[PDB]
Amino acid sequence: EYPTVSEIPVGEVRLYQIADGVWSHIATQSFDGAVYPSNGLIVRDGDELLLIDTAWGAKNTAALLAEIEKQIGLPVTRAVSTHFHDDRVGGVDVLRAAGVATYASPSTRRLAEVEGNEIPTHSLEGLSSSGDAVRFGPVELFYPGAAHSTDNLVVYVPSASVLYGGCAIHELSRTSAGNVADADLAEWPTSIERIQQRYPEAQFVIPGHGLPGGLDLLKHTTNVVKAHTNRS
Ligand SMILES: C[C@H](CS)C(=O)N1CCC[C@@H]1C(=O)O
Ligand SMILES: [Zn+2]
Ligand SMILES: [Zn+2]
Ligand SMILES: [Zn+2]
């Protein structure tokens, strides 16, 4: 029932209810001759919404806001970008123009600036050291250490037992390590271990791309990263 990359035209966004007050948002983009999906999260924050990650670009992110307005009808007041790549910050300007307060760690903001990407307005303190966790309304933000990127955050929704791994966690169907241009391959397995150790009760695990699963996604990611590391 989860929207697959084939069912979503580029420019459109789907919402998927994961649990009470938790949705993923799914968008797509073409890249290098293929089409890829990308997930973010929406978490009900009382009578407001907390958005995790843009929908990968300005056009998708405008479509995301329109779909949230139509399907949920609560204002998106804050957004957190979980790393500095365009599937996480691309569209921050659209959110900002819609009155959403945009947030990211100083590490993400610094890297987004280096990359020339959009830069969230606010800085999330307390996440600079591997293993650091901070509460942000209805979620916990956790910096597990460097993995897919040096700044990657994961997001846990304690009320729903939803672990959003972002692009540090791979869906089961992914056999390669994905875009490793900014990755710390040597630290990625240890960073995954920190996630496993902190959220062993997670019932839903949402990768940054593709289908949700369970905590099995973490061991799968470890295997995929190790296979990439061992490339010959
Ligand atoms: C823009 C994102 C950032 S994780 C990216 O690097 N990639 C490569 C894999 C999926 C997505 C893409 O461009 O297809
Ligand atoms: Zn990325
Ligand atoms: Zn990604
Ligand atoms: Zn596997």
JSON list of N, CA and C in Angstrom, two decimals, residues 3-76:
[
{"chain": "A", "resi": 3, "resn": "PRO", "atom": "N", "xyz": [3.15, 4.10, -1.37]},
{"chain": "A", "resi": 3, "resn": "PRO", "atom": "CA", "xyz": [3.33, 4.62, -2.73]},
{"chain": "A", "resi": 3, "resn": "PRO", "atom": "C", "xyz": [4.71, 4.27, -3.25]},
{"chain": "A", "resi": 4, "resn": "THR", "atom": "N", "xyz": [4.75, 3.67, -4.43]},
{"chain": "A", "resi": 4, "resn": "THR", "atom": "CA", "xyz": [6.01, 3.37, -5.07]},
{"chain": "A", "resi": 4, "resn": "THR", "atom": "C", "xyz": [6.35, 4.44, -6.09]},
{"chain": "A", "resi": 5, "resn": "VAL", "atom": "N", "xyz": [7.63, 4.49, -6.44]},
{"chain": "A", "resi": 5, "resn": "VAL", "atom": "CA", "xyz": [8.13, 5.52, -7.34]},
{"chain": "A", "resi": 5, "resn": "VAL", "atom": "C", "xyz": [7.39, 5.52, -8.68]},
{"chain": "A", "resi": 6, "resn": "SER", "atom": "N", "xyz": [6.81, 4.38, -9.08]},
{"chain": "A", "resi": 6, "resn": "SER", "atom": "CA", "xyz": [6.07, 4.30, -10.34]},
{"chain": "A", "resi": 6, "resn": "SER", "atom": "C", "xyz": [4.72, 5.00, -10.27]},
{"chain": "A", "resi": 7, "resn": "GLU", "atom": "N", "xyz": [4.11, 5.08, -9.08]},
{"chain": "A", "resi": 7, "resn": "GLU", "atom": "CA", "xyz": [2.77, 5.62, -8.94]},
{"chain": "A", "resi": 7, "resn": "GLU", "atom": "C", "xyz": [2.74, 7.13, -8.73]},
{"chain": "A", "resi": 8, "resn": "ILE", "atom": "N", "xyz": [3.89, 7.78, -8.64]},
{"chain": "A", "resi": 8, "resn": "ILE", "atom": "CA", "xyz": [3.93, 9.21, -8.34]},
{"chain": "A", "resi": 8, "resn": "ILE", "atom": "C", "xyz": [4.62, 9.94, -9.47]},
{"chain": "A", "resi": 9, "resn": "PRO", "atom": "N", "xyz": [3.89, 10.72, -10.27]},
{"chain": "A", "resi": 9, "resn": "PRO", "atom": "CA", "xyz": [4.54, 11.52, -11.31]},
{"chain": "A", "resi": 9, "resn": "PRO", "atom": "C", "xyz": [5.44, 12.57, -10.67]},
{"chain": "A", "resi": 10, "resn": "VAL", "atom": "N", "xyz": [6.55, 12.88, -11.34]},
{"chain": "A", "resi": 10, "resn": "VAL", "atom": "CA", "xyz": [7.43, 13.94, -10.85]},
{"chain": "A", "resi": 10, "resn": "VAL", "atom": "C", "xyz": [6.65, 15.24, -10.79]},
{"chain": "A", "resi": 11, "resn": "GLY", "atom": "N", "xyz": [6.75, 15.93, -9.66]},
{"chain": "A", "resi": 11, "resn": "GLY", "atom": "CA", "xyz": [5.93, 17.08, -9.38]},
{"chain": "A", "resi": 11, "resn": "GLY", "atom": "C", "xyz": [4.79, 16.82, -8.41]},
{"chain": "A", "resi": 12, "resn": "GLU", "atom": "N", "xyz": [4.40, 15.56, -8.24]},
{"chain": "A", "resi": 12, "resn": "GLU", "atom": "CA", "xyz": [3.34, 15.19, -7.31]},
{"chain": "A", "resi": 12, "resn": "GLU", "atom": "C", "xyz": [3.93, 14.63, -6.02]},
{"chain": "A", "resi": 13, "resn": "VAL", "atom": "N", "xyz": [3.15, 14.75, -4.95]},
{"chain": "A", "resi": 13, "resn": "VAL", "atom": "CA", "xyz": [3.53, 14.27, -3.63]},
{"chain": "A", "resi": 13, "resn": "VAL", "atom": "C", "xyz": [2.38, 13.46, -3.07]},
{"chain": "A", "resi": 14, "resn": "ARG", "atom": "N", "xyz": [2.70, 12.32, -2.46]},
{"chain": "A", "resi": 14, "resn": "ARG", "atom": "CA", "xyz": [1.73, 11.50, -1.76]},
{"chain": "A", "resi": 14, "resn": "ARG", "atom": "C", "xyz": [2.05, 11.53, -0.27]},
{"chain": "A", "resi": 15, "resn": "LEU", "atom": "N", "xyz": [1.00, 11.40, 0.53]},
{"chain": "A", "resi": 15, "resn": "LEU", "atom": "CA", "xyz": [1.13, 11.25, 1.96]},
{"chain": "A", "resi": 15, "resn": "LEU", "atom": "C", "xyz": [0.71, 9.84, 2.33]},
{"chain": "A", "resi": 16, "resn": "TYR", "atom": "N", "xyz": [1.39, 9.27, 3.32]},
{"chain": "A", "resi": 16, "resn": "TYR", "atom": "CA", "xyz": [1.09, 7.92, 3.76]},
{"chain": "A", "resi": 16, "resn": "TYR", "atom": "C", "xyz": [1.01, 7.92, 5.28]},
{"chain": "A", "resi": 17, "resn": "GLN", "atom": "N", "xyz": [-0.15, 7.58, 5.83]},
{"chain": "A", "resi": 17, "resn": "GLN", "atom": "CA", "xyz": [-0.28, 7.54, 7.28]},
{"chain": "A", "resi": 17, "resn": "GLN", "atom": "C", "xyz": [0.40, 6.30, 7.83]},
{"chain": "A", "resi": 18, "resn": "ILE", "atom": "N", "xyz": [1.44, 6.51, 8.64]},
{"chain": "A", "resi": 18, "resn": "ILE", "atom": "CA", "xyz": [2.21, 5.42, 9.23]},
{"chain": "A", "resi": 18, "resn": "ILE", "atom": "C", "xyz": [1.59, 4.96, 10.54]},
{"chain": "A", "resi": 19, "resn": "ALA", "atom": "N", "xyz": [1.18, 5.92, 11.35]},
{"chain": "A", "resi": 19, "resn": "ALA", "atom": "CA", "xyz": [0.58, 5.69, 12.65]},
{"chain": "A", "resi": 19, "resn": "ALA", "atom": "C", "xyz": [-0.23, 6.94, 12.98]},
{"chain": "A", "resi": 20, "resn": "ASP", "atom": "N", "xyz": [-0.87, 6.92, 14.14]},
{"chain": "A", "resi": 20, "resn": "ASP", "atom": "CA", "xyz": [-1.64, 8.08, 14.58]},
{"chain": "A", "resi": 20, "resn": "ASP", "atom": "C", "xyz": [-0.74, 9.31, 14.64]},
{"chain": "A", "resi": 21, "resn": "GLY", "atom": "N", "xyz": [-1.11, 10.35, 13.89]},
{"chain": "A", "resi": 21, "resn": "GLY", "atom": "CA", "xyz": [-0.36, 11.59, 13.89]},
{"chain": "A", "resi": 21, "resn": "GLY", "atom": "C", "xyz": [1.00, 11.54, 13.22]},
{"chain": "A", "resi": 22, "resn": "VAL", "atom": "N", "xyz": [1.31, 10.48, 12.48]},
{"chain": "A", "resi": 22, "resn": "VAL", "atom": "CA", "xyz": [2.58, 10.39, 11.75]},
{"chain": "A", "resi": 22, "resn": "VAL", "atom": "C", "xyz": [2.29, 9.99, 10.32]},
{"chain": "A", "resi": 23, "resn": "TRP", "atom": "N", "xyz": [2.82, 10.76, 9.38]},
{"chain": "A", "resi": 23, "resn": "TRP", "atom": "CA", "xyz": [2.75, 10.47, 7.96]},
{"chain": "A", "resi": 23, "resn": "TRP", "atom": "C", "xyz": [4.15, 10.49, 7.39]},
{"chain": "A", "resi": 24, "resn": "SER", "atom": "N", "xyz": [4.38, 9.69, 6.37]},
{"chain": "A", "resi": 24, "resn": "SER", "atom": "CA", "xyz": [5.48, 10.01, 5.49]},
{"chain": "A", "resi": 24, "resn": "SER", "atom": "C", "xyz": [4.94, 10.79, 4.30]},
{"chain": "A", "resi": 25, "resn": "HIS", "atom": "N", "xyz": [5.81, 11.60, 3.71]},
{"chain": "A", "resi": 25, "resn": "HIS", "atom": "CA", "xyz": [5.54, 12.21, 2.43]},
{"chain": "A", "resi": 25, "resn": "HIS", "atom": "C", "xyz": [6.51, 11.63, 1.42]},
{"chain": "A", "resi": 26, "resn": "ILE", "atom": "N", "xyz": [6.00, 11.38, 0.22]},
{"chain": "A", "resi": 26, "resn": "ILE", "atom": "CA", "xyz": [6.76, 10.69, -0.81]},
{"chain": "A", "resi": 26, "resn": "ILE", "atom": "C", "xyz": [6.70, 11.54, -2.07]},
{"chain": "A", "resi": 27, "resn": "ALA", "atom": "N", "xyz": [7.86, 11.84, -2.63]},
{"chain": "A", "resi": 27, "resn": "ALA", "atom": "CA", "xyz": [7.96, 12.59, -3.87]},
{"chain": "A", "resi": 27, "resn": "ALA", "atom": "C", "xyz": [8.97, 11.88, -4.75]},
{"chain": "A", "resi": 28, "resn": "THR", "atom": "N", "xyz": [9.14, 12.36, -5.98]},
{"chain": "A", "resi": 28, "resn": "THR", "atom": "CA", "xyz": [10.06, 11.71, -6.90]},
{"chain": "A", "resi": 28, "resn": "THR", "atom": "C", "xyz": [10.85, 12.76, -7.67]},
{"chain": "A", "resi": 29, "resn": "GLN", "atom": "N", "xyz": [12.00, 12.33, -8.18]},
{"chain": "A", "resi": 29, "resn": "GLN", "atom": "CA", "xyz": [12.74, 13.11, -9.16]},
{"chain": "A", "resi": 29, "resn": "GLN", "atom": "C", "xyz": [13.45, 12.16, -10.09]},
{"chain": "A", "resi": 30, "resn": "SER", "atom": "N", "xyz": [13.67, 12.63, -11.31]},
{"chain": "A", "resi": 30, "resn": "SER", "atom": "CA", "xyz": [14.53, 11.92, -12.25]},
{"chain": "A", "resi": 30, "resn": "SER", "atom": "C", "xyz": [15.98, 12.26, -11.94]},
{"chain": "A", "resi": 31, "resn": "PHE", "atom": "N", "xyz": [16.85, 11.27, -12.09]},
{"chain": "A", "resi": 31, "resn": "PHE", "atom": "CA", "xyz": [18.28, 11.53, -11.95]},
{"chain": "A", "resi": 31, "resn": "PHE", "atom": "C", "xyz": [19.03, 10.47, -12.73]},
{"chain": "A", "resi": 32, "resn": "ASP", "atom": "N", "xyz": [19.92, 10.91, -13.61]},
{"chain": "A", "resi": 32, "resn": "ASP", "atom": "CA", "xyz": [20.84, 10.01, -14.29]},
{"chain": "A", "resi": 32, "resn": "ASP", "atom": "C", "xyz": [20.09, 8.87, -14.99]},
{"chain": "A", "resi": 33, "resn": "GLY", "atom": "N", "xyz": [18.96, 9.21, -15.60]},
{"chain": "A", "resi": 33, "resn": "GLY", "atom": "CA", "xyz": [18.23, 8.26, -16.42]},
{"chain": "A", "resi": 33, "resn": "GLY", "atom": "C", "xyz": [17.24, 7.37, -15.68]},
{"chain": "A", "resi": 34, "resn": "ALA", "atom": "N", "xyz": [17.08, 7.54, -14.38]},
{"chain": "A", "resi": 34, "resn": "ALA", "atom": "CA", "xyz": [16.15, 6.75, -13.60]},
{"chain": "A", "resi": 34, "resn": "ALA", "atom": "C", "xyz": [15.24, 7.69, -12.83]},
{"chain": "A", "resi": 35, "resn": "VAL", "atom": "N", "xyz": [14.20, 7.13, -12.21]},
{"chain": "A", "resi": 35, "resn": "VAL", "atom": "CA", "xyz": [13.36, 7.90, -11.30]},
{"chain": "A", "resi": 35, "resn": "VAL", "atom": "C", "xyz": [13.50, 7.33, -9.90]},
{"chain": "A", "resi": 36, "resn": "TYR", "atom": "N", "xyz": [13.65, 8.21, -8.93]},
{"chain": "A", "resi": 36, "resn": "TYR", "atom": "CA", "xyz": [13.87, 7.84, -7.56]},
{"chain": "A", "resi": 36, "resn": "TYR", "atom": "C", "xyz": [12.80, 8.44, -6.68]},
{"chain": "A", "resi": 37, "resn": "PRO", "atom": "N", "xyz": [12.34, 7.72, -5.67]},
{"chain": "A", "resi": 37, "resn": "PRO", "atom": "CA", "xyz": [11.44, 8.30, -4.68]},
{"chain": "A", "resi": 37, "resn": "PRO", "atom": "C", "xyz": [12.27, 8.86, -3.53]},
{"chain": "A", "resi": 38, "resn": "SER", "atom": "N", "xyz": [11.62, 9.70, -2.74]},
{"chain": "A", "resi": 38, "resn": "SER", "atom": "CA", "xyz": [12.25, 10.25, -1.56]},
{"chain": "A", "resi": 38, "resn": "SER", "atom": "C", "xyz": [11.16, 10.44, -0.52]},
{"chain": "A", "resi": 39, "resn": "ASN", "atom": "N", "xyz": [11.47, 10.09, 0.72]},
{"chain": "A", "resi": 39, "resn": "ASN", "atom": "CA", "xyz": [10.55, 10.18, 1.84]},
{"chain": "A", "resi": 39, "resn": "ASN", "atom": "C", "xyz": [10.94, 11.29, 2.79]},
{"chain": "A", "resi": 40, "resn": "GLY", "atom": "N", "xyz": [9.94, 11.93, 3.37]},
{"chain": "A", "resi": 40, "resn": "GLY", "atom": "CA", "xyz": [10.11, 12.70, 4.58]},
{"chain": "A", "resi": 40, "resn": "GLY", "atom": "C", "xyz": [9.03, 12.29, 5.55]},
{"chain": "A", "resi": 41, "resn": "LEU", "atom": "N", "xyz": [8.89, 13.05, 6.62]},
{"chain": "A", "resi": 41, "resn": "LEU", "atom": "CA", "xyz": [7.96, 12.73, 7.68]},
{"chain": "A", "resi": 41, "resn": "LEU", "atom": "C", "xyz": [7.12, 13.95, 8.01]},
{"chain": "A", "resi": 42, "resn": "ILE", "atom": "N", "xyz": [5.91, 13.71, 8.47]},
{"chain": "A", "resi": 42, "resn": "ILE", "atom": "CA", "xyz": [5.06, 14.75, 9.03]},
{"chain": "A", "resi": 42, "resn": "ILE", "atom": "C", "xyz": [4.58, 14.22, 10.37]},
{"chain": "A", "resi": 43, "resn": "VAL", "atom": "N", "xyz": [4.71, 15.04, 11.41]},
{"chain": "A", "resi": 43, "resn": "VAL", "atom": "CA", "xyz": [4.35, 14.62, 12.76]},
{"chain": "A", "resi": 43, "resn": "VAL", "atom": "C", "xyz": [3.40, 15.65, 13.33]},
{"chain": "A", "resi": 44, "resn": "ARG", "atom": "N", "xyz": [2.23, 15.20, 13.77]},
{"chain": "A", "resi": 44, "resn": "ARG", "atom": "CA", "xyz": [1.29, 16.10, 14.42]},
{"chain": "A", "resi": 44, "resn": "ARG", "atom": "C", "xyz": [1.87, 16.59, 15.74]},
{"chain": "A", "resi": 45, "resn": "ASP", "atom": "N", "xyz": [1.83, 17.91, 15.92]},
{"chain": "A", "resi": 45, "resn": "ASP", "atom": "CA", "xyz": [2.40, 18.62, 17.06]},
{"chain": "A", "resi": 45, "resn": "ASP", "atom": "C", "xyz": [1.26, 19.42, 17.68]},
{"chain": "A", "resi": 46, "resn": "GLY", "atom": "N", "xyz": [0.43, 18.73, 18.46]},
{"chain": "A", "resi": 46, "resn": "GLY", "atom": "CA", "xyz": [-0.78, 19.34, 18.97]},
{"chain": "A", "resi": 46, "resn": "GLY", "atom": "C", "xyz": [-1.75, 19.65, 17.84]},
{"chain": "A", "resi": 47, "resn": "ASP", "atom": "N", "xyz": [-1.96, 20.93, 17.58]},
{"chain": "A", "resi": 47, "resn": "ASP", "atom": "CA", "xyz": [-2.79, 21.39, 16.47]},
{"chain": "A", "resi": 47, "resn": "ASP", "atom": "C", "xyz": [-1.96, 21.98, 15.34]},
{"chain": "A", "resi": 48, "resn": "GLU", "atom": "N", "xyz": [-0.67, 21.68, 15.32]},
{"chain": "A", "resi": 48, "resn": "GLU", "atom": "CA", "xyz": [0.23, 22.08, 14.25]},
{"chain": "A", "resi": 48, "resn": "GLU", "atom": "C", "xyz": [0.94, 20.83, 13.74]},
{"chain": "A", "resi": 49, "resn": "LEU", "atom": "N", "xyz": [1.74, 21.01, 12.70]},
{"chain": "A", "resi": 49, "resn": "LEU", "atom": "CA", "xyz": [2.50, 19.92, 12.11]},
{"chain": "A", "resi": 49, "resn": "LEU", "atom": "C", "xyz": [3.97, 20.26, 12.13]},
{"chain": "A", "resi": 50, "resn": "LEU", "atom": "N", "xyz": [4.77, 19.25, 12.42]},
{"chain": "A", "resi": 50, "resn": "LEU", "atom": "CA", "xyz": [6.21, 19.31, 12.28]},
{"chain": "A", "resi": 50, "resn": "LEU", "atom": "C", "xyz": [6.57, 18.53, 11.03]},
{"chain": "A", "resi": 51, "resn": "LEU", "atom": "N", "xyz": [7.26, 19.17, 10.11]},
{"chain": "A", "resi": 51, "resn": "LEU", "atom": "CA", "xyz": [7.70, 18.53, 8.88]},
{"chain": "A", "resi": 51, "resn": "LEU", "atom": "C", "xyz": [9.15, 18.09, 9.04]},
{"chain": "A", "resi": 52, "resn": "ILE", "atom": "N", "xyz": [9.44, 16.87, 8.65]},
{"chain": "A", "resi": 52, "resn": "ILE", "atom": "CA", "xyz": [10.82, 16.41, 8.57]},
{"chain": "A", "resi": 52, "resn": "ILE", "atom": "C", "xyz": [11.15, 16.28, 7.10]},
{"chain": "A", "resi": 53, "resn": "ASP", "atom": "N", "xyz": [12.06, 17.14, 6.65]},
{"chain": "A", "resi": 53, "resn": "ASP", "atom": "CA", "xyz": [12.61, 17.16, 5.31]},
{"chain": "A", "resi": 53, "resn": "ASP", "atom": "C", "xyz": [11.67, 17.72, 4.26]},
{"chain": "A", "resi": 54, "resn": "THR", "atom": "N", "xyz": [12.26, 18.41, 3.29]},
{"chain": "A", "resi": 54, "resn": "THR", "atom": "CA", "xyz": [11.49, 18.87, 2.15]},
{"chain": "A", "resi": 54, "resn": "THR", "atom": "C", "xyz": [11.13, 17.68, 1.27]},
{"chain": "A", "resi": 55, "resn": "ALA", "atom": "N", "xyz": [10.36, 17.95, 0.23]},
{"chain": "A", "resi": 55, "resn": "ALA", "atom": "CA", "xyz": [10.00, 16.93, -0.74]},
{"chain": "A", "resi": 55, "resn": "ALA", "atom": "C", "xyz": [10.93, 16.90, -1.94]},
{"chain": "A", "resi": 56, "resn": "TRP", "atom": "N", "xyz": [12.19, 17.31, -1.76]},
{"chain": "A", "resi": 56, "resn": "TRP", "atom": "CA", "xyz": [13.20, 17.21, -2.81]},
{"chain": "A", "resi": 56, "resn": "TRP", "atom": "C", "xyz": [12.91, 18.19, -3.93]},
{"chain": "A", "resi": 57, "resn": "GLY", "atom": "N", "xyz": [13.10, 19.46, -3.64]},
{"chain": "A", "resi": 57, "resn": "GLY", "atom": "CA", "xyz": [13.02, 20.51, -4.62]},
{"chain": "A", "resi": 57, "resn": "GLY", "atom": "C", "xyz": [11.83, 21.43, -4.39]},
{"chain": "A", "resi": 58, "resn": "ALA", "atom": "N", "xyz": [11.93, 22.62, -4.97]},
{"chain": "A", "resi": 58, "resn": "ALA", "atom": "CA", "xyz": [10.92, 23.64, -4.74]},
{"chain": "A", "resi": 58, "resn": "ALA", "atom": "C", "xyz": [9.56, 23.21, -5.25]},
{"chain": "A", "resi": 59, "resn": "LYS", "atom": "N", "xyz": [9.50, 22.65, -6.46]},
{"chain": "A", "resi": 59, "resn": "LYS", "atom": "CA", "xyz": [8.20, 22.31, -7.03]},
{"chain": "A", "resi": 59, "resn": "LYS", "atom": "C", "xyz": [7.53, 21.21, -6.22]},
{"chain": "A", "resi": 60, "resn": "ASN", "atom": "N", "xyz": [8.27, 20.16, -5.89]},
{"chain": "A", "resi": 60, "resn": "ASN", "atom": "CA", "xyz": [7.71, 19.10, -5.07]},
{"chain": "A", "resi": 60, "resn": "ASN", "atom": "C", "xyz": [7.30, 19.65, -3.71]},
{"chain": "A", "resi": 61, "resn": "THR", "atom": "N", "xyz": [8.09, 20.57, -3.16]},
{"chain": "A", "resi": 61, "resn": "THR", "atom": "CA", "xyz": [7.79, 21.04, -1.81]},
{"chain": "A", "resi": 61, "resn": "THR", "atom": "C", "xyz": [6.55, 21.92, -1.80]},
{"chain": "A", "resi": 62, "resn": "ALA", "atom": "N", "xyz": [6.34, 22.71, -2.85]},
{"chain": "A", "resi": 62, "resn": "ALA", "atom": "CA", "xyz": [5.07, 23.43, -2.97]},
{"chain": "A", "resi": 62, "resn": "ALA", "atom": "C", "xyz": [3.91, 22.44, -3.06]},
{"chain": "A", "resi": 63, "resn": "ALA", "atom": "N", "xyz": [4.09, 21.36, -3.83]},
{"chain": "A", "resi": 63, "resn": "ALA", "atom": "CA", "xyz": [3.06, 20.33, -3.92]},
{"chain": "A", "resi": 63, "resn": "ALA", "atom": "C", "xyz": [2.84, 19.65, -2.58]},
{"chain": "A", "resi": 64, "resn": "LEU", "atom": "N", "xyz": [3.91, 19.47, -1.81]},
{"chain": "A", "resi": 64, "resn": "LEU", "atom": "CA", "xyz": [3.78, 18.89, -0.48]},
{"chain": "A", "resi": 64, "resn": "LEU", "atom": "C", "xyz": [2.92, 19.77, 0.42]},
{"chain": "A", "resi": 65, "resn": "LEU", "atom": "N", "xyz": [3.18, 21.08, 0.44]},
{"chain": "A", "resi": 65, "resn": "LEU", "atom": "CA", "xyz": [2.38, 21.97, 1.27]},
{"chain": "A", "resi": 65, "resn": "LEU", "atom": "C", "xyz": [0.92, 21.95, 0.85]},
{"chain": "A", "resi": 66, "resn": "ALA", "atom": "N", "xyz": [0.67, 21.93, -0.46]},
{"chain": "A", "resi": 66, "resn": "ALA", "atom": "CA", "xyz": [-0.71, 21.89, -0.94]},
{"chain": "A", "resi": 66, "resn": "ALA", "atom": "C", "xyz": [-1.39, 20.59, -0.53]},
{"chain": "A", "resi": 67, "resn": "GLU", "atom": "N", "xyz": [-0.66, 19.47, -0.58]},
{"chain": "A", "resi": 67, "resn": "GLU", "atom": "CA", "xyz": [-1.26, 18.19, -0.22]},
{"chain": "A", "resi": 67, "resn": "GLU", "atom": "C", "xyz": [-1.52, 18.10, 1.28]},
{"chain": "A", "resi": 68, "resn": "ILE", "atom": "N", "xyz": [-0.61, 18.64, 2.09]},
{"chain": "A", "resi": 68, "resn": "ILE", "atom": "CA", "xyz": [-0.83, 18.68, 3.53]},
{"chain": "A", "resi": 68, "resn": "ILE", "atom": "C", "xyz": [-2.07, 19.49, 3.85]},
{"chain": "A", "resi": 69, "resn": "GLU", "atom": "N", "xyz": [-2.20, 20.66, 3.20]},
{"chain": "A", "resi": 69, "resn": "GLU", "atom": "CA", "xyz": [-3.36, 21.52, 3.39]},
{"chain": "A", "resi": 69, "resn": "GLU", "atom": "C", "xyz": [-4.65, 20.78, 3.05]},
{"chain": "A", "resi": 70, "resn": "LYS", "atom": "N", "xyz": [-4.62, 19.97, 1.99]},
{"chain": "A", "resi": 70, "resn": "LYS", "atom": "CA", "xyz": [-5.82, 19.30, 1.51]},
{"chain": "A", "resi": 70, "resn": "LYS", "atom": "C", "xyz": [-6.16, 18.07, 2.35]},
{"chain": "A", "resi": 71, "resn": "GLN", "atom": "N", "xyz": [-5.16, 17.29, 2.75]},
{"chain": "A", "resi": 71, "resn": "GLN", "atom": "CA", "xyz": [-5.39, 16.00, 3.40]},
{"chain": "A", "resi": 71, "resn": "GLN", "atom": "C", "xyz": [-5.40, 16.09, 4.92]},
{"chain": "A", "resi": 72, "resn": "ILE", "atom": "N", "xyz": [-4.61, 16.99, 5.51]},
{"chain": "A", "resi": 72, "resn": "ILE", "atom": "CA", "xyz": [-4.49, 17.09, 6.95]},
{"chain": "A", "resi": 72, "resn": "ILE", "atom": "C", "xyz": [-5.09, 18.38, 7.48]},
{"chain": "A", "resi": 73, "resn": "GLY", "atom": "N", "xyz": [-4.85, 19.50, 6.81]},
{"chain": "A", "resi": 73, "resn": "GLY", "atom": "CA", "xyz": [-5.52, 20.73, 7.17]},
{"chain": "A", "resi": 73, "resn": "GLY", "atom": "C", "xyz": [-5.04, 21.38, 8.45]},
{"chain": "A", "resi": 74, "resn": "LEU", "atom": "N", "xyz": [-3.83, 21.01, 8.92]},
{"chain": "A", "resi": 74, "resn": "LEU", "atom": "CA", "xyz": [-3.18, 21.67, 10.03]},
{"chain": "A", "resi": 74, "resn": "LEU", "atom": "C", "xyz": [-1.94, 22.40, 9.53]},
{"chain": "A", "resi": 75, "resn": "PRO", "atom": "N", "xyz": [-1.60, 23.55, 10.12]},
{"chain": "A", "resi": 75, "resn": "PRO", "atom": "CA", "xyz": [-0.48, 24.33, 9.61]},
{"chain": "A", "resi": 75, "resn": "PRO", "atom": "C", "xyz": [0.86, 23.67, 9.90]},
{"chain": "A", "resi": 76, "resn": "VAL", "atom": "N", "xyz": [1.75, 23.73, 8.92]},
{"chain": "A", "resi": 76, "resn": "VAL", "atom": "CA", "xyz": [3.13, 23.31, 9.10]},
{"chain": "A", "resi": 76, "resn": "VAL", "atom": "C", "xyz": [3.86, 24.50, 9.70]}
]
